[PDB]
Every structure is written in C-alpha cells, then in structure tokens.
C-alpha cells in the first residue's frame, strides 16, 4: 500500500508560500487527490487544511500546495521536521 505524503518540498518558492501565505508544499504520490492530501496532512502534523492545489510535475511526481487555517502557523509546523 502506498503512502500519500512522500516528503516536504523545500525551495525558495515553497519557503515564501510558507512565510507569506501559511502554505506548506509536499511531494505526494501521483495517485492522491486533493482530498486525500488534505486528510493525510492534518493527520501527520495535526493541523487544519483549508485548501489544496496540486500539480503533476516534470519530475514525475505530484506536488501539492497545502494552505493551513489561520489557526496554525506553517513556519512552526515546517520547523519541527
């Protein structure tokens, strides 16, 4: 059975979405839907997902841009990992 989240996507652009928009980015399995990515995240880091945006990258894997609720602080979550 495949897992949804593969690893955080840390790049200058990812850092901004985190600082300025409370969004975290991950490399996910390309069979995962936005909904499956949202649930996966809330359970892995215990946070609330407001919105998810996905893109099928030219690297072969799927990238997801998860925006957290104003109740959580992206930077903080990203920091522990």
């Amino acid at each position: 059975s495949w897992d949804v989240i593969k690893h955080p996507h840390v790049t200058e652009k990812a850092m901004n979405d985190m600082d300025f928009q409370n969004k975290l980015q991950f490399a996910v399995d390309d069979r995962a839907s936005k909904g499956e990515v949202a649930d996966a995240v809330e359970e892995q880091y215990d946070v609330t997902v407001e919105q998810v945006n996905t893109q099928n990258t030219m690297d072969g894997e799927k990238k997801a841009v998860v925006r957290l609720s104003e109740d959580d602080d992206a930077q903080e979550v990203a920091s522990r990992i």
Binding site: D30, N56, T57, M58, D59, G60
Partner: protein, 46 residues
C-alpha cells in the same frame, strides 16, 4: 500539443535520464552517458 499524464511521466523520465555520469562513478571505475540526448538534435519517442 497536449500531453496526457502518462506522456508526461515518460518525458519526465527522459529528462532525468539525460544527466552527467556522477563525478564519483568515474573515480570508482578509475576512468560518458551514451544515452545523452539533446532536444534539438535528437528525437524522443511518441
């Protein structure tokens, strides 16, 4: 043109496949990517 999810995975692979032979492999083997390709000079499948 428009690419399907699968066509994208393939092109994606062909891109990664198009790399230098790790510097260290040349040491380990005491001294070429024969499949190195160029977008203009070569032609991929499909």
């Amino acid at each position: 043109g428009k690419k399907s999810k699968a066509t994208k995975k393939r092109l994606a692979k062909l891109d990664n496949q198009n790399s230098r032979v790790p510097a260290w492999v040349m040491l380990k083997t005491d001294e070429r990517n024969h499949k190195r390709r160029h977008w203009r000079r070569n032609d991929t499948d499909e």
